[PDB]
Design a protein around this motif. Structure first.
Motif, short mmCIF file in Angstrom:
data_model
loop_
_atom_site.label_atom_id
_atom_site.label_comp_id
_atom_site.label_asym_id
_atom_site.label_seq_id
_atom_site.Cartn_x
_atom_site.Cartn_y
_atom_site.Cartn_z
N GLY A 249 39.00 35.95 1.62
CA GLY A 249 38.10 36.76 2.43
C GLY A 249 36.64 36.42 2.18
O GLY A 249 35.81 36.40 3.10
N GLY A 250 36.30 36.15 0.92
CA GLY A 250 34.93 35.84 0.60
C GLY A 250 34.51 34.55 1.28
O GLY A 250 33.39 34.43 1.79
N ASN A 251 35.41 33.58 1.29
CA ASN A 251 35.12 32.29 1.91
C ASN A 251 34.89 32.44 3.41
O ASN A 251 34.05 31.75 3.99
CB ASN A 251 36.25 31.29 1.63
CG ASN A 251 36.27 30.85 0.16
OD1 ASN A 251 35.26 30.95 -0.55
ND2 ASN A 251 37.42 30.37 -0.30
N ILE A 252 35.62 33.36 4.02
CA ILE A 252 35.47 33.63 5.44
C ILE A 252 34.10 34.21 5.75
O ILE A 252 33.41 33.76 6.66
CB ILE A 252 36.57 34.57 5.94
CG1 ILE A 252 37.90 33.81 5.99
CG2 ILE A 252 36.21 35.11 7.31
CD1 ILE A 252 39.12 34.69 6.14
N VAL A 253 33.69 35.21 4.97
CA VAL A 253 32.40 35.85 5.20
C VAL A 253 31.24 34.95 4.80
O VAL A 253 30.22 34.92 5.48
CB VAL A 253 32.33 37.23 4.52
CG1 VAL A 253 30.95 37.86 4.69
CG2 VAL A 253 33.39 38.12 5.12
N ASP A 254 31.41 34.21 3.71
CA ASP A 254 30.42 33.22 3.29
C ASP A 254 30.21 32.18 4.39
O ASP A 254 29.08 31.78 4.68
CB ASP A 254 30.92 32.52 2.03
CG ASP A 254 29.82 31.84 1.26
OD1 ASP A 254 28.66 32.30 1.36
OD2 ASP A 254 30.11 30.85 0.55
N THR A 255 31.30 31.75 5.02
CA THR A 255 31.20 30.79 6.12
C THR A 255 30.46 31.39 7.31
O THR A 255 29.55 30.77 7.86
CB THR A 255 32.59 30.30 6.58
OG1 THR A 255 33.16 29.50 5.54
CG2 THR A 255 32.49 29.46 7.85
N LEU A 256 30.83 32.61 7.70
CA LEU A 256 30.13 33.29 8.79
C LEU A 256 28.62 33.39 8.55
O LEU A 256 27.82 33.07 9.43
CB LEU A 256 30.73 34.67 9.04
CG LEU A 256 30.00 35.56 10.05
CD1 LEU A 256 29.79 34.83 11.39
CD2 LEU A 256 30.75 36.88 10.26
N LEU A 257 28.24 33.80 7.34
CA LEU A 257 26.82 33.96 7.03
C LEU A 257 26.05 32.63 7.09
O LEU A 257 24.85 32.61 7.33
CB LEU A 257 26.63 34.66 5.68
CG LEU A 257 27.02 36.15 5.62
CD1 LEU A 257 26.97 36.68 4.19
CD2 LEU A 257 26.09 36.96 6.52
N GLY A 258 26.76 31.52 6.87
CA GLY A 258 26.15 30.20 6.95
C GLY A 258 25.84 29.83 8.39
O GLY A 258 24.96 29.01 8.65
N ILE A 259 26.55 30.44 9.34
CA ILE A 259 26.31 30.21 10.76
C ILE A 259 25.24 31.17 11.26
O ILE A 259 24.42 30.82 12.12
CB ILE A 259 27.62 30.41 11.58
CG1 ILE A 259 28.58 29.24 11.35
CG2 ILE A 259 27.33 30.52 13.06
CD1 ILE A 259 29.92 29.38 12.08
N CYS A 260 25.24 32.38 10.72
CA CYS A 260 24.25 33.39 11.07
C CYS A 260 24.18 34.44 9.97
O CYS A 260 25.20 35.05 9.64
CB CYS A 260 24.60 34.05 12.40
SG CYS A 260 23.42 35.33 12.90
N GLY A 261 22.99 34.66 9.42
CA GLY A 261 22.83 35.56 8.30
C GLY A 261 22.37 36.95 8.69
O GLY A 261 21.95 37.74 7.84
#
Length: 300
Positions: A14-26
């Motif tokens: 789950g952390g990797n998923i949210v970390d990835t999302l934030l890399g696209i838009c914070g």
């Protein structure tokens, strides 16, 4: 709006998923929660983390006394957020074991907030304990949310791509594209209030993007077949959001995707996207894991 959302990823996946999302838009808010400090420390884009002082029995045991501190962490920093979305790899110890209680407990404590769940189902090749965790995770969420009626569910399927990292990247893109349907445009647009309504709709949500090129029924069929979301077998949804580069035949989209009781349509300059919400939760796809468990047990 992205600022009104807070993600609570729990565990490594789950952390990797949210970390990835934030890399696209914070523009989103996030509190990463984990038993593993190494995992938290290895996040690239985590502004807020909470460390809890594969085995869901153990994850649960350490966290029980802390469920309320955890919920308080989220509410302290992000009390202005009306949407709380927990995210977990369902095969993961912490993710499978800790997410359902915390979500069930938060829902009871904050009845006026909207809650959602992004869960990833494991590949067919994974082993028994993995599938057993995913099943238990699903069942515990069902039991605590009136079979998925009290929350919105984004159910992802690792069988649909080679690498988990591809599921993650694609989900982040689809979700962020979904949130961008309000980007100003002439003329019609999917309002921010409508985006809100799609976000707060309960049960299952599926996001599709399709090719501007071929026949629209064919393009959407490809999109569904290749979808990173768990397959659904029903033919109705509640609210549907449609944002397309050109005029399209909305009746043909409903024909392939599901018949909504309400549609918000708009245009944008970039992509063709359908968001279907309120879909019956994908019990059939989830239950297939039982067949995997049976067969792997036979082997033993």
């Amino acid at each position: 709006m992205k600022n009104k959302i807070v993600f609570a990823p729990i565990g490594q996946g789950g952390g990797n998923i949210v970390d990835t999302l934030l890399g696209i838009c914070g523009d989103y808010n996030a509190l990463f929660i984990n038993t593993s400090k190494k995992d938290l420390d290895s996040l690239k884009h985590a502004k807020h983390t909470y460390h809890i002082p594969k085995e869901r029995k153990k994850a649960v045991g350490y966290a029980q006394t802390y469920y309320k501190q955890i919920i308080a962490q989220i509410m302290e920093k992000f009390s202005s957020c009306d949407i709380v979305i927990f995210v977990a790899t369902m095969a993961g110890g912490a993710g499978s074991g800790i997410t359902p209680p915390i979500l069930g407990l938060a829902k009871q404590m904050y009845p006026n907030k909207h809650f959602g769940f992004v869960g990833v189902l494991p590949k067919a090749t994974e082993d028994i304990d993995e599938h057993m965790n995913a099943i238990a995770c699903w069942n515990d969420i069902m039991r605590s949310t009136n079979e998925g009626k009290d929350i919105s569910i984004y159910l992802l399927d690792n069988n649909k791509r080679e690498k988990e990292s591809d599921i993650n990247k694609e989900f982040a893109t689809l979700f962020n594209d979904f949130m961008n349907m309000s980007e100003s445009h002439a003329e019609g647009v999917v309002d921010e209030d409508e985006i809100s309504k799609l976000l707060t709709m309960k049960k299952s949500n599926v996001i599709l993007e399709f090719d501007d090129k071929e026949d629209i029924q064919v393009a959407l069929a490809k999109s569904l077949k290749e979808s990173i979301f768990a397959e659904y077998t029903t033919n109705t949804c509640e609210f549907m959001g449609i944002s397309t580069t050109r005029v399209v035949d909305v009746e043909a989209i409903k024909s392939i995707v599901g018949y909504p009781r309400r549609t918000f349509k708009g245009y944008n300059s970039k992509k063709n996207i359908v968001v279907a919400t309120g879909i019956e939760p994908q019990k059939t796809t989830v239950q297939m894991m039982n067949e995997i468990i049976e067969d792997k047990m036979k082997q033993r």
